[PDB]
Design a protein around this ligand. Structure first.
Ligand SMILES: NC(=O)C1=CN([C@@H]2O[C@H](COP(=O)(O)OP(=O)(O)OC[C@H]3O[C@@H](n4cnc5c(N)ncnc54)[C@H](O)[C@@H]3O)[C@@H](O)[C@H]2O)C=CC1
Ligand SMILES: Cc1cc2nc3c(=O)[nH]c(=O)nc-3n(C[C@H](O)[C@H](O)[C@H](O)COP(=O)(O)O)c2cc1C
Ligand code: SF4
Ligand code: SF4
Ligand code: SF4
Ligand code: FES
Ligand code: FES
Ligand SMILES: [K+]
Lengths: 430, 263, 44, 213
């Protein structure tokens, strides 16, 4: 298989993505959810971890770590501490609105994912750390969890398997940083959402100091479909090391901004011109695309023509796949205003723990605020580049990286527009 | 013995498992720079001044928090270790106030000294600096929170050694502030020791304020008599007048702290 | 019958400000007994 | 916008706060979601519960959450000042939150911020004099394909125009509660000109299930 995309509706994992079917238990059981869950759980942890490792599932949260290799870190004998699957439903990334759709429209798929993943990792309970802004989605998921407790699908003797497993929902309180897994762990523990340093990875010391795996809503909700359909079925999509399907959020300057489930290595132009109705003003009106939400660097129109929407082809396009949140920016966009508003987001959403993010993201926001007006001299472009390189890899979590990278992409692909901004400032003010 | 072998700049050293990178470099006589690490407080890892290159690793590690794995070669003086130190010192000094003449910490400032030893000689910060509202935590500790570099030694001392739980961080990002959030008075029997471990002049001694300056003081090593603990102290004088009383480290008595009556 | 034309998720139009917490209170009877660390708090 | 507390006569440690008894049963249900010995993990819900009863957080709700969870009060003040939802000043009855990050800015959130400002006669951060509307300007709310959008107290109002948000403020001032949805033709997040996917009926239970299961 050399061409990708054009995913059929029989291959969709997230049927009822759009809210057109019943999200409750009667609607979910007639779409395939909770089918033979007892038979999956009674095949033990090793079979489920083998199905996830065989599927080539990489972490849908945005980093793309191998999910079965990640979840096998819990597969070890206990030492008195309980074990916890913690589901990352925070989703603070600008551009990203897919986990909201999973929680709002396919909640039992997430609950069965919690059960299957927690059985795979020996977890006692599931904390679904949901965004506090998603109040309707959290009450929606709580109604589904009540339907799962009353059907005997979770809790004491889950699905008739003799495995006891609770599913808790924890609401956030308005922090983007509480999507990061250790800061999310600190936020569940009743503290400020400040990221822990690594090591200890959360499989050693996680929530309450227990063994813990934090996993995205999307990489959890696909796991019972992987265990039913087979790992080879999931691995038959996308390129190699880029297996499966993916939810995409096309937003910004397209005709039809939408969430859509697509095969992994689909071209960006095919995705936009098929599911989004194209760029406003046609494809020739395209200026730039932030491929995967705010933390990934932008790519210009010449790179968007041939690139594939998986992890490896976007790393080769010197950006990241990220959360697969495609923000489209047409030729009428002030791109420095957009990237500076993005860096303004990153300084309003930065917890303040370590020095390079706490100081340098505010200092990058001040430099970007002068760059929008042109109130600068061109030697401050390169300086800002080095400022980004002083934040990148020097911080605790990757929010410092996620604030350095849009600056780097903007400079790398749009230095002359910055320079002409500054020189027209210099000629109209001096 | 189950000692693992690590390397500091190629020099082999046998360390106990669980030892951090900073302690392994301490064992060869190298002192990694630090602001939030303190050997009598818990590990914070939030100033990033101790970032050091492990070779064949494309990312510096917080040496105060990272444990040594067997076979690491800690490059305490490689080029990217020094670039990390200069970058982190640049961010520490970006919003820091130009108060070095009017600051009691001047001459005995960790921030000044390892700005001289490990950071750049000049500035690229062409912006306006933040200014933090001061706090009132008592008659012993003068509080000038613009000088704060958010190392949280306040909070770890007050929580872990003094056992008080009144200091904390409010806010988020660059607007994050250290304080009690209310008009509350931090009066422990060990409250003046936060003057010692604050690396900057954000917490200073209100009785000692402005009177002396560290290079001109003479340091007489002596004994506390305010109790029968027998704390080891430095009576620092100047021209025949007692200026202040600092602690001496004695591991078996007063580890490096003194009481407020002693101070 | 099959229907793909309406939006079936109309429940959240009727949620109040205590919907989540009353649902958690309803769920409290179903749950497994919590583990204990052996002390009342880390300050005990 | 400050992160130190100054005792005013309406915000002081003797401002009357106490939970209702049904809120105490809700707090018992919250604390039972966490292991014994980690009651402090219930700081964030219970404090938010204190905001859902009182509308905002004086510093006696913080002290009550610190007292009934046996945590120090500074550990509650850190949570209350870290997280952007805890209102440490009394907001109006409808707390309008306009998202102005880049996916909502590219679909003209500035027009709707301006329309709310010229409908309410206030600007960002102010409250209307009848204490009904507090207009602030927030970051990404996770409704990016439904740009531009706002949030009112629990609800997302999506795919907005200036006329739509004027109509929403009209039927908020009339006492009614509007529908939390996209004000365009679509329902939740689908492509607006018809479905580009999922047009088939779902296959049902047992489709594609591998052998040996
Ligand atoms: N989904 C969203 O809303 C957002 C997603 N992101 C994305 O998140 C990514 C950055 O997140 P991080 O978690 O910091 O990335 P990555 O450095 O940490 O690690 C990914 C996952 O693998 C695990 N892991 C990695 N190495 C491990 C090891 N040796 N042992 C055990 N576990 C290991 C980590 O615990 C983590 O859960 C970026 O790609 C960014 O685009 C960023 C912001 C928002
Ligand atoms: C600042 C920051 C915010 C993050 N926010 C989220 C998030 O909101 N949701 C999410 O699933 N992952 C988020 N992540 C990625 C997590 O660290 C982690 O990789 C993920 O939640 C779980 O791993 P997974 O991809 O295997 O599911 C964030 C990372 C960082 C650095
Ligand atoms: S880099 Fe920013 S987001 Fe990460 S621990 Fe530091 S202050 Fe927090
Ligand atoms: S704390 Fe140190 S660097 Fe800051 S003003 Fe005082 S002497 Fe200067
Ligand atoms: S006042 Fe001093 S000890 Fe306290 S956090 Fe700031 S720099 Fe550290
Ligand atoms: S000393 Fe290690 S980061 Fe502060
Ligand atoms: S950008 Fe406004 S909701 Fe995400
Ligand atoms: K000091």
């Amino acid at each position: 298989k050399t061409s990708f995309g054009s995913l059929k509706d029989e291959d969709r994992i997230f049927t009822n993505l759009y809210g057109r079917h019943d999200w409750r238990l009667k609607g979910a059981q007639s779409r395939g959810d909770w089918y033979k869950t007892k038979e999956i759980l009674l095949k033990g942890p090793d079979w489920i971890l083998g199905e996830v490792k065989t599927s080539g599932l990489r972490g849908r949260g945005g980093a793309g770590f191998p999910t079965g290799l990640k979840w096998s870190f819990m597969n070890k004998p206990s030492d008195g501490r309980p074990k916890y699957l913690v589901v990352n439903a925070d989703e603070g990334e600008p551009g990203t609105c897919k986990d909201r759709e999973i929680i709002r429209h396919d909640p039992h798929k997430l609950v069965e994912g919690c059960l299957v993943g927690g059985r795979a990792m020996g977890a006692r309970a599931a904390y679904i750390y949901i965004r506090g802004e998603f109040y309707n989605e959290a009450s929606n998921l709580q109604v589904a969890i009540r339907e799962a407790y009353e059907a005997g699908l979770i809790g004491k003797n889950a699905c008739g398997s003799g495995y006891d497993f609770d599913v808790f929902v924890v609401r956030g309180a308005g922090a983007y940083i509480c999507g990061e897994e250790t800061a999310l762990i600190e936020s569940i523990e009743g503290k400020q959402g400040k990221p822990r340093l690594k090591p200890p990875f959360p499989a050693d010391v996680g929530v309450f100091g227990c063994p813990t795996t934090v996993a995205n809503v999307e990489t959890v909700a696909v796991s019972p479909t992987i265990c039913r359909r087979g790992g080879a079925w999931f691995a038959s999509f996308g390129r190699e090391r880029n297996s499966g399907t993916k939810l995409f959020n096309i937003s910004g300057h397209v005709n039809n901004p939408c969430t859509v489930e697509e095969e992994m290595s689909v071209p960006l132009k095919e995705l936009i011109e098929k599911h989004a109705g194209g760029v406003t003003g046609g494809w020739d009106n395209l200026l730039a695309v932030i491929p995967g939400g705010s933390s990934t660097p932008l790519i210009p129109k010449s790179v968007c023509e041939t690139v594939l929407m998986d992890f490896d082809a976007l790393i080769q396009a010197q950006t990241g796949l990220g959360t697969a949140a495609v923000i489209v920016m047409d030729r009428s966009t002030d791109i420095v205003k957009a990237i500076a508003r993005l860096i303004e987001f990153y300084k309003h959403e930065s917890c303040g723990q370590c020095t390079p993010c706490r100081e340098g993201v505010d200092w990058m926001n001040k430099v970007m605020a002068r760059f929008v007006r042109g109130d600068a001299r061109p030697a401050e472009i390169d300086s800002l580049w080095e400022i980004s390189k002083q934040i990148e890899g020097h911080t605790i979590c990757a929010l410092g990286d996620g604030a350095a990278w849009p600056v780097q992409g903007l400079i790398r692909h749009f230095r002359p527009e910055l320079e002409e901004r500054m020189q027209r400032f210099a000629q109209q003010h001096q | 013995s189950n000692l693992i072998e690590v390397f500091v700049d190629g020099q082999s050293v046998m360390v106990e498992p669980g030892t951090t990178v900073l302690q392994a470099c301490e064992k060869v006589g190298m002192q990694i720079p630090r602001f939030c690490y303190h050997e009598r407080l818990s590990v914070a890892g939030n100033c990033r001044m101790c970032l050091v290159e492990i070779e064949k690793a494309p990312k510096v590690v917080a040496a105060c928090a990272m444990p040594v794995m067997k076979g690491w070669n800690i490059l305490t003086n490689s080029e990217k270790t020094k670039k990390a130190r200069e970058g982190v010192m640049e961010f520490l000094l970006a919003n820091h106030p130009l108060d070095c003449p009017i600051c009691d910490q001047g001459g005995e400032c960790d921030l000044q000294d390892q700005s001289m030893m490990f950071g750049s000689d000049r500035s690229r910060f062409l912006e306006g600096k933040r200014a933090v509202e001061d706090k009132n935590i008592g008659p012993l500790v003068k509080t000038i929170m613009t000088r704060c570099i958010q190392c949280t030694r306040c909070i770890r001392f007050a929580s872990e050694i003094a056992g008080v739980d009144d200091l904390g961080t409010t806010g988020r990002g660059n607007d994050m502030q250290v304080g009690t959030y209310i008009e509350k008075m931090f009066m422990s029997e060990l409250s003046g020791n936060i003057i010692d471990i604050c690396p900057v002049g954000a917490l200073t001694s209100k009785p000692y304020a402005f009177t002396a300056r560290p290079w001109e003081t003479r340091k007489t090593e002596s004994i506390d008599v305010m109790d029968a603990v027998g704390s080891n102290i430095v009576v620092s004088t100047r021209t025949g007048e007692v200026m202040r009383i600092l602690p001496r480290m004695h591991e078996d008595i007063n580890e490096e702290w003194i009481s407020d009556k002693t101070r | 019958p099959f229907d793909n034309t309406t939006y079936k998720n109309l429940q959240h139009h009727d949620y109040s400000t205590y919907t989540f917490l009353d649902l958690n209170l309803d769920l409290s009877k179903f749950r497994m007994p919590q583990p204990s660390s052996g002390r009342e708090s880390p300050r005990h | 916008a400050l992160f130190v507390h100054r005792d005013t006569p309406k915000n002081n440690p003797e401002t009357p706060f106490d939970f209702t008894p049904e809120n105490y049963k809700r707090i018992e249900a919250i604390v039972k979601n966490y292991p014994e010995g980690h009651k402090a993990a219930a700081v964030l819900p219970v404090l938010d519960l204190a905001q859902r009863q009182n509308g905002w957080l004086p510093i006696s709700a913080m002290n009550k959450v610190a007292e009934i969870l046996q945590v120090p009060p500074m550990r509650v003040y850190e949570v209350a000042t870290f997280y952007t939802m805890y209102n440490r000043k009394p907001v109006g009855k409808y707390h309008i939150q306009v998202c102005t990050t880049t996916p909502c800015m590219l679909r003209n959130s500035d027009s709707i911020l301006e329309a709310i400002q010229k409908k309410l006669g206030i600007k960002v951060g102010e409250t209307t004099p009848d204490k009904l509307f507090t207009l602030i300007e927030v970051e990404c709310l996770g409704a990016c394909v439904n740009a531009p959008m706002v949030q009112i107290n629990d609800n997302y109002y999506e795919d907005l125009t200036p006329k739509d948000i004027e109509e929403i403020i009209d039927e908020l001032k009339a006492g009614k509660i509007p529908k939390p949805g996209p004000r365009s033709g679509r329902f939740s997040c689908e492509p607006a000109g018809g479905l580009t996917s999922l047009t088939e009926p779902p296959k049902g239970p047992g489709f594609g299930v591998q052998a040996g299961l």
